[PDB]
Hints:
monomer, 153 residues, mainly alpha, Globin-like, binds protoporphyrin IX containing FE, iron, Globin, EC 1.11.1.-
Amino acid sequence: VLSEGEWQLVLHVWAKVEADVAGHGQDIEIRLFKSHPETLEKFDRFKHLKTEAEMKASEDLKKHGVTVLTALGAILKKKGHHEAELKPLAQSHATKHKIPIKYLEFISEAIIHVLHSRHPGDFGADAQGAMNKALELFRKDIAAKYKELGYQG
Ligand code: HEM
């Protein structure tokens, strides 16, 4: 569980993300694909993108990044009370996209990296620890929902 203080650090940095959701989304997706190239294989829509500049130029990827971060933001703002928001995400990611928890670890790393790159003065060690706990909770709860659907992490 996160403390109220921890949730407030999470939401304080998230408000920074909300000042440019598209830009943060692009950076996070690109960081994910750069650091863990195998993840790009999961995207029939994007795996044709051959360079970083192509990725940055893709309106489709940018739109998708906003969708991703909008869903994550909606989850984080519930401060753990996110069953209604998490269930449909688990459904699609378990049964359609087939995303293992290890890949959710990869994107969590990418999120931390981008938030620190863009907002170091509002994302120090304690804030990173809080965001890490929030994303750990998300991964734990989604893994439980995966199993409920018959998908083994
Ligand atoms: C913070 C973690 C994540 C969030 C919040 C998130 C959110 C979303 C949302 C909202 C959608 C559109 C609706 C849906 O299909 O559920 C989506 C689609 C998708 N996600 Fe994720 N996602 C996450 C992690 C990942 C990861 C790590 C991968 C792959 C390594 C992935 C692969 C996909 C794919 C392939 C689609 C379909 C894209 C398309 O063709 O339109 N997701 N995601």
